[PDB]
């Protein structure tokens, strides 16, 4: 059980590192997309399709 706990902690830290890298490198990808979301939200609130 001690060995299992140690290896579980190891895999946990490696998974955490890879997940942090994934989030960091996907934030940039979605940075370009969020413009569309903002524009569409503005269009909905204004009642007209605001292009900007």
């Amino acid at each position: 059980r001690a060995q299992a706990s140690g290896e579980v902690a190891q895999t946990l830290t490696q998974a955490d590192q890879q997940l942090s890298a994934q989030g960091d490198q996907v934030r940039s990808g979605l940075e370009s997309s969020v413009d569309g979301l903002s524009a569409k939200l503005a269009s909905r609130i204004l009642g007209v399709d605001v292009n900007s």
């Binding site: 989030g23 524009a39 939200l41 609130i45």
Partner: protein, 339 residues
Amino acid sequence: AQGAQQIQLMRQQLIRQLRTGLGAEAVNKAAEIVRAHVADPQAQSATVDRFLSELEQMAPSSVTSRLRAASRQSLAALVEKFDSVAGGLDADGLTNLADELASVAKLLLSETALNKHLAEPTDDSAPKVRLLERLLSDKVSATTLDLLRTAVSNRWSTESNLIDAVEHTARLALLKRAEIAGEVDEVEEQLFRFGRVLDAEPRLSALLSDYTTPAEGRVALLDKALTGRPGVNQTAAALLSQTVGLLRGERADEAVIDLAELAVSRRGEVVAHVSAAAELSDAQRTRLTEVLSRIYGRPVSVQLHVDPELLGGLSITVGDEVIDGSIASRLAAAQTGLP
């Protein structure tokens, strides 16, 4: 299995963090976009027109608060009596009646036991009438004496209501002479403007709201500062001075709001305070008046309050009811409704 579940939970934690961050960024960007676009006055007109169309499609509804039932009935009887009496009087006579009513109200303020006795409910009124006559049968006109007789004949929930009623009657008299002058619209607009400015200058109202200070000092301050101005109607100035003279711990601006309410009410219309970020065109004003009257049936008078924070749209309000069409409220709802 526990380690695998922990990995899944940490992935979900990262996902939730990203959702919060992206949602915040998107709502902020949308707010910036709307605030930038709405700076165009044509966009303001377009959103106002859309809101007016919505109001047109809105389903019509067939639907003095502090006064209690007995007090409301007494005030109704008193105003009916005033309508019966002062109708035949002239502008000078109406001014005299208003001045005498204000003077007697100030006298009632000066002494408390007399007010308590006069306003004390009782089945009979003859003792009260005799008391009033023995007090001031000489210093008031016949019309004023009869109006006060009627006022004290009925009953009021609280002592102050009595003086309030008298104050109310006084205002009516002034309003009536305004109708004789034919400048009712001008005085209504002047009262609304004075209420607006008093709202904008809270310190001035506070300096006027301290009833402890002598009435003459506050009245002279207002005259030299606000009430006395070249482009001010004399009737509005007199009404405001009388109101501030009888300010029994109520704010000056709220008193002016009450004055405007009464002025519009005596005409039969109902005031609708419409908050807008830009001034409306005459066509917009007419359309808004028509639609508001249609939903509320009774004729309504629209009072525009400029407020750029709304970012377009309108925020109508009558009584305890509000139609919140402002764009800012929609933006807040969008921000608060996101996952």
